[PDB]
Design an enzyme around this catalytic site. Structure first.
Site, mmCIF file in Angstrom:
data_model
loop_
_atom_site.group_PDB
_atom_site.id
_atom_site.type_symbol
_atom_site.label_atom_id
_atom_site.label_comp_id
_atom_site.label_asym_id
_atom_site.label_seq_id
_atom_site.Cartn_x
_atom_site.Cartn_y
_atom_site.Cartn_z
ATOM 1 C CG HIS A 1 -0.814 0.764 2.331
ATOM 2 N ND1 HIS A 1 -0.643 -0.222 3.427
ATOM 3 C CD2 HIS A 1 -0.903 2.095 2.816
ATOM 4 C CE1 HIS A 1 -0.094 0.761 4.278
ATOM 5 N NE2 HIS A 1 -0.367 2.056 3.874
ATOM 6 C CG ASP B 1 -0.456 -3.874 2.944
ATOM 7 O OD1 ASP B 1 0.041 -3.252 1.828
ATOM 8 O OD2 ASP B 1 -0.698 -2.976 3.827
ATOM 9 C CB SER C 1 2.233 2.173 6.343
ATOM 10 O OG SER C 1 1.142 2.989 6.941
ATOM 11 N N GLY C 2 4.451 -0.051 6.529
ATOM 12 C CA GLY C 2 5.627 -0.791 5.893
ATOM 13 C C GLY C 2 6.800 -1.068 6.992
HETATM 14 N N1 LIG Z 1 -3.458 2.033 14.262
HETATM 15 C C1 LIG Z 1 -2.457 1.636 13.378
HETATM 16 N N2 LIG Z 1 -1.732 0.880 13.697
HETATM 17 C C2 LIG Z 1 -2.187 2.218 12.139
HETATM 18 C C3 LIG Z 1 -1.496 1.551 11.143
HETATM 19 C C4 LIG Z 1 -1.163 1.954 9.975
HETATM 20 C C5 LIG Z 1 -1.869 3.168 9.246
HETATM 21 N N3 LIG Z 1 -1.841 3.804 8.291
HETATM 22 C C6 LIG Z 1 -2.459 4.841 8.165
HETATM 23 C C7 LIG Z 1 -2.982 5.681 7.079
HETATM 24 C C8 LIG Z 1 -4.036 6.587 7.248
HETATM 25 C C9 LIG Z 1 -4.296 7.423 5.783
HETATM 26 C C10 LIG Z 1 -3.306 7.303 4.978
HETATM 27 C C11 LIG Z 1 -2.280 6.495 4.946
HETATM 28 C C12 LIG Z 1 -1.146 6.087 3.970
HETATM 29 O O1 LIG Z 1 -1.107 4.727 4.090
HETATM 30 C C13 LIG Z 1 0.224 6.762 4.479
HETATM 31 C C14 LIG Z 1 1.414 6.115 3.717
HETATM 32 C C15 LIG Z 1 1.064 6.085 2.102
HETATM 33 C C16 LIG Z 1 -0.256 5.954 1.791
HETATM 34 C C17 LIG Z 1 -1.470 6.290 2.565
HETATM 35 N N4 LIG Z 1 -2.023 5.745 6.239
HETATM 36 C C18 LIG Z 1 -3.337 4.888 9.608
HETATM 37 C C19 LIG Z 1 -2.915 3.896 10.276
HETATM 38 C C20 LIG Z 1 -2.678 3.156 11.567
#
Ligand SMILES: N=C(N)c1ccc2[nH]c(-c3cccc(C4(O)CCCCC4)n3)cc2c1
Length: 361
Positions: free
Chosen positions: A151, A201, A297-298
């Site tokens: 993602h 993912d 993320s990642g």
């Molecule tokens: N509580 C948790 N563990 C957790 C984990 C991982 C999470 N990612 C997000 C979130 C939200 C809006 C946009 C994004 C993007 O993925 C940021 C990187 C590139 C693409 C867009 N991530 C929330 C969130 C929460």
């Protein structure tokens, strides 16, 4: 710490496998297929690859705590996913046996509600930047390969000349910043193809050149073959993500300690309502407060064990998603790395010379 049934000597790299029937360790009888037996054995234990191998002789080397030998069924070898499936007890007349140098990993050579960390504490952590901003974390598996999330690479973020991989420092403004040759993402990732269901993912980043391995840059190990995620166990998530959902990215890499939460609880209606698919797991606190977030993320979810007879960190999860950040009864959801072991090896074995975005089902 119940030992892994496959081990490799830190002294001389001899491989040893456990005999259920007798409680002994046995060596592996050298054969024409030493090379794949080597790689397969490293893979088995959760190392990425065998860098080199060799033959040893029990007349010049000693048994060093082993009683006899296993032989490898070389006909089955190239088709097995498990070393334990292709070995049988044997006399190994010539007393020559296999040793393998694996790609070392998981070892130090020195986020919401977490702490500032120091250099070398988490030397597999990378920052993945597109156009100068940090978008995603990733975990070094070698000097040239990074495990991250699919993602992180939606339609607009697929021009590779624009990605950089930042390693070697914990402050975003400090370090080494290298290009990307290819991204191998999982083709079972339905959103990349509507938009959907966040299973599969997972992606691999191949850097256009390898990073040096130092006290600040080291790979993580992978879960060993058949290694279970143990519920309640406290592991560590790190990253440069937002310290509150509606907040700013951390300027200094953060760490947070979070327990694995059983799918029993996590799938419960109180929590995630059957959204937790079997190659996903949850980690965090029923109360919330400590969690990964946007921009982690990642990145690595890492758990320390001693099953290789020495303490090692292994990348058990990848930060995938969650409903908000640090919410009570909404823990972090992670990609279950152990479920993608053969996918990681196949991808690297197949797409090592590739450029651009490659799909691997
Ligand atoms: N509580 C948790 N563990 C957790 C984990 C991982 C999470 N990612 C997000 C979130 C939200 C809006 C946009 C994004 C993007 O993925 C940021 C990187 C590139 C693409 C867009 N991530 C929330 C969130 C929460």
């Amino acid at each position: 710490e119940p030992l892994y049934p496959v081990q490799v000597s830190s002294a001389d790299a001899r491989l040893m496998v456990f005999d259920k029937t007798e409680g002994t360790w046995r060596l592996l009888c050298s054969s024409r297929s030493n090379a794949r037996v080597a790689g397969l054995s490293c893979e088995e234990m959760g190392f990425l690859r065998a860098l080199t191998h060799s033959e040893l002789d029990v007349r010049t080397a000693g048994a060093n705590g082993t009683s006899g030998f296993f032989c490898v069924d070389e006909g089955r070898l190239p088709h097995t996913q498990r070393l334990l499936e292709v070995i049988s007890v044997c006399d190994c007349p010539r007393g020559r046996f296999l040793a393998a140098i694996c790609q070392d990993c998981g070892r130090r050579k020195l986020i919401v509600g977490g702490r500032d960390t120091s250099l070398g504490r988490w030397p597999w952590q990378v920052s993945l930047r597109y156009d100068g901003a940090h978008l995603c974390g990733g975990s070094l598996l070698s000097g040239d390969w990074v495990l991250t999330a699919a993602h992180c690479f939606p339609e607009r973020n697929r021009v590779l000349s624009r990605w950089r991989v930042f390693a070697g420092a914990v402050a975003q403004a400090s370090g080494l910043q290298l290009g990307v040759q290819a991204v191998v993402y999982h083709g079972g990732y339905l959103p990349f193809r509507p938009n959907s269901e966040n299973s599969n993912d997972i992606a691999l980043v191949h850097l256009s050149s390898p990073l040096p391995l130092t006290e600040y840059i080291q790979p993580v190990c992978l879960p060993a073959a058949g290694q279970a995620l143990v519920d309640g166990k406290i592991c560590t998530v790190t990253g440069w993500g937002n310290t509150q959902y509606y907040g700013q990215q951390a300027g200094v890499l953060q760490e947070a300690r979070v327990p694995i939460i059983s799918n029993d609880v996590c799938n419960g209606a109180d929590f995630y309502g059957n959204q937790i698919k079997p190659k996903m797991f949850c980690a965090g606190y029923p109360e919330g407060g400590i969690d990964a977030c946007q921009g982690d993320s990642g990145g690595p979810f890492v758990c320390e064990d001693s099953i290789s007879r020495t303490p090692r960190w292994r990348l058990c999860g990848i930060v995938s998603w969650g409903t908000g950040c640090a919410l009570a009864q909404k823990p972090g959801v992670y990609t279950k790395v152990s479920d993608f072991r053969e996918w990681i090896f196949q991808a690297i074995k197949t797409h090592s010379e590739a450029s651009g975005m490659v799909t691997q089902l």
